[PDB]
Design an enzyme around this catalytic site. Structure first.
Site, PDB file in Angstrom:
ATOM      1  N   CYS B 118       0.888  -1.320   0.085  1.00 30.87           N
ATOM      2  CA  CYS B 118      -0.046  -0.086   0.073  1.00 30.87           C
ATOM      3  C   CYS B 118       0.655   1.232  -0.049  1.00 30.87           C
ATOM      4  O   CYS B 118       1.653   1.679   0.843  1.00 30.87           O
ATOM      5  CB  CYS B 118      -0.963  -0.008   1.023  1.00 30.87           C
ATOM      6  SG  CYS B 118      -1.985   1.643   1.406  1.00 30.87           S
ATOM      7  N   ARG B 121      -0.373   4.504   2.900  1.00 30.38           N
ATOM      8  CA  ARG B 121       0.030   4.443   4.420  1.00 30.38           C
ATOM      9  C   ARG B 121       0.084   5.695   4.977  1.00 30.38           C
ATOM     10  O   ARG B 121       0.111   5.335   6.414  1.00 30.38           O
ATOM     11  CB  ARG B 121       0.798   3.153   4.404  1.00 30.38           C
ATOM     12  CG  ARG B 121       0.283   2.013   4.175  1.00 30.38           C
ATOM     13  CD  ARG B 121       1.545   0.742   4.631  1.00 30.38           C
ATOM     14  NE  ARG B 121       2.380   0.484   3.648  1.00 30.38           N
ATOM     15  CZ  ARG B 121       3.605   0.193   3.881  1.00 30.38           C
ATOM     16  NH1 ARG B 121       3.866  -0.270   5.012  1.00 30.38           N
ATOM     17  NH2 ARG B 121       4.395   0.056   2.596  1.00 30.38           N
ATOM     18  N   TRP B 290      -8.919   5.976  -0.823  1.00 30.48           N
ATOM     19  CA  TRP B 290      -9.475   6.659  -2.055  1.00 30.48           C
ATOM     20  C   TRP B 290      -8.496   6.093  -3.213  1.00 30.48           C
ATOM     21  O   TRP B 290      -7.534   5.253  -3.212  1.00 30.48           O
ATOM     22  CB  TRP B 290      -9.521   8.175  -2.057  1.00 30.48           C
ATOM     23  CG  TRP B 290      -8.256   8.768  -1.441  1.00 30.48           C
ATOM     24  CD1 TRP B 290      -6.925   9.026  -1.742  1.00 30.48           C
ATOM     25  CD2 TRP B 290      -8.183   9.372   0.014  1.00 30.48           C
ATOM     26  NE1 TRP B 290      -6.031   9.677  -0.826  1.00 30.48           N
ATOM     27  CE2 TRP B 290      -6.851   9.850   0.157  1.00 30.48           C
ATOM     28  CE3 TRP B 290      -9.101   9.391   1.313  1.00 30.48           C
ATOM     29  CZ2 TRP B 290      -6.289  10.393   1.336  1.00 30.48           C
ATOM     30  CZ3 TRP B 290      -8.659  10.050   2.347  1.00 30.48           C
ATOM     31  CH2 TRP B 290      -7.192  10.331   2.462  1.00 30.48           C
ATOM     32  N   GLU B 295      -4.537   3.766 -11.160  1.00 24.86           N
ATOM     33  CA  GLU B 295      -5.041   2.554 -11.111  1.00 24.86           C
ATOM     34  C   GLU B 295      -6.167   2.508 -12.138  1.00 24.86           C
ATOM     35  O   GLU B 295      -6.318   1.258 -12.687  1.00 24.86           O
ATOM     36  CB  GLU B 295      -6.025   2.533  -9.548  1.00 24.86           C
ATOM     37  CG  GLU B 295      -4.975   2.725  -8.344  1.00 24.86           C
ATOM     38  CD  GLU B 295      -5.570   2.390  -7.213  1.00 24.86           C
ATOM     39  OE1 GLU B 295      -6.056   1.407  -6.799  1.00 24.86           O
ATOM     40  OE2 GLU B 295      -5.557   3.450  -6.450  1.00 24.86           O
TER      41      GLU B 295
END
Ligand code: HEM
Ligand code: HEM
Ligand SMILES: C[C@H](O)[C@H](O)[C@H]1CNc2nc(N)[nH]c(=O)c2N1
Ligand SMILES: C[C@H](O)[C@H](O)[C@H]1CNc2nc(N)[nH]c(=O)c2N1
Ligand SMILES: [Zn+2]
Lengths: 420, 420
Positions: B118, B121, B290, B295
């Site tokens: 991730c 973070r 979010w 992506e």
């Protein structure tokens, strides 16, 4: 048994059996992955005091001769048996052994084949080998290197080649090229706080000047060859300018680009790596292939720690350079890349764009698994510095391992050299 | 001792001491790196028949309670001691134990903190926790999930949240969401050889239709929630359309873009992961943060195996689409990305571009090393699918390891479900 590998783009699945032939302990641990480290001990082969223990040399030697003879379609068994005996006889007689030119040729191509961080490996069988194992002086080193540079360049029509110098004997008579690359630019820290040229070659340019090189304080000053022969101290040699072929940058649209006064050498030649093969090790064996645009366009030009040109290429393109979210950096880097590829294409110098490179590597990877059951690959190095997932290699799961022969990193010479 | 980590862009060096607290065996081996594998066994926590062996539960439990109480500036020792005793008493009495809401809250944030893949973070402490541990029916699952979706969306102003369902007891009463994501589009294979929607959700959409979902044969058809409660078979629930917020795409220059008829849901919510904490495991605990433009722009839209829009975005931009070396793909993907970020920005929906994301993660990584001596990181996942080296994270060497608490992958439910 075997390891399952998937290509998330094509859905294709592959089985890796080759990793079973891997040397000794690699980069990572039982509880953590360190594949992100640039220079791990596992990719490095250091110094030696005494010659190689024979109990180690012989099995390695026998395994290499077995591999070599096991490589031709319809092998020569009486030759294979004869070579094993001769090699053993030689090891017990002289303390070490000499490779035939043919075995060396085979060694160099196989070590390239086994380079997990190289994208250009589809070319592995097209390699010119310069046998400089008879060499003894720094001056002869310099002459060999010049022949290399000359041959390799071929006036833009780049040819892949390697030049092998004498193998490590006791460990205190090592032949070494102190340069990271055959051809490379100097980096000086300027009076005004800045840095000119290649910020990466800072510490080294300082070494060159300390051994008496004449600093031409510019931005594209081709550094000198710093040669170490037998056990001796390194001697500095100027690379004949006629030998160094460069490419000046220019965009097929943005005519203001060339006014940037940018260029790069047409020859990517790794100078400081070590070739291991059958118990033997060659600490001096510079090699070259051709460039891949991103190396120059993205890394050389745009890296913070290198040339760092993004800020102003953005400015000169209009772009909101103070708004990260505008994606200016994306815009610029793309143009800096078409420049490189156009400039190289126009000036008739071999170059390869990353998309075609990635596609050729994928074809190579399939050929490899089909041919030997695997292909050592380092995803972190194989995926281009831009357009990640737009390339096929991003979606390919891969296994990284050290086979033999292999090209290892070496502990930088100034840190271990006993000066005389 | 510690592991040395370098940032090749800034020259900064860091020491990792945190990897010593890593669970058990990770992804790689003594002789090879497999950090390139998408779903390794080391990142997956499978099924269970019988409850957790107490000899295993107790040490894990005690270690978690020790970690929790060891986390506040000026700890409450009498509370810490009391909690250890109560937990032990509960384990020996009921066979397992229940976390306080406060411990759960702490667990969820720490597992996020420990997610090596991730980038977001830096936000780890801002997480809303929905306690649904009292839940028992699929219908109640569906209601909780709707509250989640509603809260998370907040009409574009995305808020990070997680909803924790009942912990695995014996292993045959598991609560599971069969969906990969809370909100996700359907993918159907069309009569004409093609595939519409999301090619990634093919096999799953087929499962949905087999359990009686009504296929609306379009390109952006939000799939249904497929809920598994207690031990039971999964029930299909339609997501109330009013709850699903989307963003239609449009370029601030190329007005023909919107005529592409493209959109994407504003909510990135992982539905199928398992939360481990102090011997306990929660097989149903959907969470969301979010989006990061790439992506949608790069992966969702441009991947071969997903929407695959590159070919025609190139065409509609002029571009020599049949000349790889022209770098069209680079050109297009950059525009598809400014669209996404503009479309999201215009429609007042939270989004984060990869450059600012990378910069925030780097700041987080420093905070982490300073705060606890490390930050588990997966370079292969952390480096954006485009503009690799243009981002800071590419030049940062990192260590990847599994701590606890943690979010694990699970073996897909249809492969292990004993239907009734
Ligand atoms: C024919 C053209 C070739 C192409 C296009 C090619 C391309 C590349 C690229 C793009 C890299 C990464 C450079 C970097 O990021 O530092 C690389 C690395 C490498 N290549 Fe190839 N290569 C070619 C030929 C060769 C040859 C002829 C050899 C050896 C005989 C070779 C050995 C390696 C090795 C060992 C590395 C790793 C260097 C390091 O670790 O720093 N390559 N190559
Ligand atoms: C606040 C905004 C956040 C941002 C911008 C963010 C961004 C990202 C991105 C870009 C990915 C990669 C997605 C992919 O390639 O599949 C990801 C993965 C992940 N994130 Fe974050 N995230 C955020 C919040 C969260 C939260 C709130 C959690 C959990 C409480 C979380 C847990 C994870 C996990 C476990 C993964 C790995 C998913 C997988 O392995 O498939 N993230 N996040
Ligand atoms: C830290 C990280 O390993 C480093 O920046 C990398 C990543 N991948 C790379 N890939 C290539 N081909 N060349 C490089 O220099 C690097 N360096
Ligand atoms: C095969 C390879 O592991 C795979 O394509 C990767 C690489 N890095 C990634 N990075 C992110 N963030 N998300 C992904 O899906 C992947 N997938
Ligand atoms: Zn590894």
């Amino acid at each position: 048994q075997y390891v399952r590998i998937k290509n998330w783009g094509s859905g294709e699945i592959l089985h890796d059996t080759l990793h079973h032939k891997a040397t000794s302990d690699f980069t990572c641990k039982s509880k953590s992955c360190l594949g992100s480290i640039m220079n791990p001990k596992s990719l490095t082969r250091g110094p030696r005091d005494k010659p190689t223990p024979l109990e180690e040399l012989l099995p390695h030697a026998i395994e290499f001769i077995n591999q070599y003879y096991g490589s031709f379609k319809e092998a020569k068994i009486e030759e294979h048996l004869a070579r094993l005996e001769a090699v053993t006889k030689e090891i017990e007689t002289t303390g070490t052994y000499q490779l035939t030119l043919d075995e060396l040729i085979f060694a160099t191509k196989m070590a390239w084949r086994n380079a997990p961080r190289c994208i250009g490996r589809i070319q592995w069988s097209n390699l010119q080998v310069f046998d400089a194992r008879n060499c003894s002086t720094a001056q002869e080193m310099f002459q060999h290197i010049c022949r290399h540079i000359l041959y390799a360049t071929n006036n833009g029509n780049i040819r892949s080649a390697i030049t092998v110098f004498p193998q490590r004997s006791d460990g205190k008579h090592d032949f070494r090229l102190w340069n990271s690359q055959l051809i490379r630019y100097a980096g000086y820290q300027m009076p005004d706080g800045t840095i000119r040229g290649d910020a990466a070659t800072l510490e080294f340019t300082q070494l060159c000047i300390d051994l008496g090189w004449k600093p031409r304080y510019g931005r594209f000053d081709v550094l000198p060859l710093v040669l170490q022969a037998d056990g001796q101290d390194p001697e500095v040699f100027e690379i004949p300018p006629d030998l160094v072929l460069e490419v000046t940058m220019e965009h097929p649209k943005y005519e203001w680009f060339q006014e940037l006064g940018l260029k790069w050498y047409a020859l990517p030649a790794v100078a400081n790596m070590l070739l291991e093969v059958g118990g033997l090790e060659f600490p001096a064996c510079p090699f070259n292939g051709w460039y891949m645009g991103t190396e120059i366009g993205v890394r050389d030009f745009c890296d913070t720690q290198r040339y760092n040109i993004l800020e102003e290429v953005g400015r000169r393109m209009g772009l909101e350079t103070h708004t990260l979210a505008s994606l200016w950096k994306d815009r610029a880097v793309t143009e800096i890349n078409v420049a490189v590829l156009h400039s190289f294409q126009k000036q008739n110098v071999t170059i390869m764009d990353h998309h075609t490179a990635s596609e050729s590597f994928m074809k190579h990877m399939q050929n490899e698994y089909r041919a030997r059951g695997g292909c050592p690959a380092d995803w972190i190095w194989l995926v281009p510095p831009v357009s990640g997932s737009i390339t096929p290699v991003f979606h390919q799961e891969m296994l990284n391992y050290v086979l033999s022969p292999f090209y290892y990193y070496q502990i930088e010479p100034w840190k271990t050299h006993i000066w005389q």
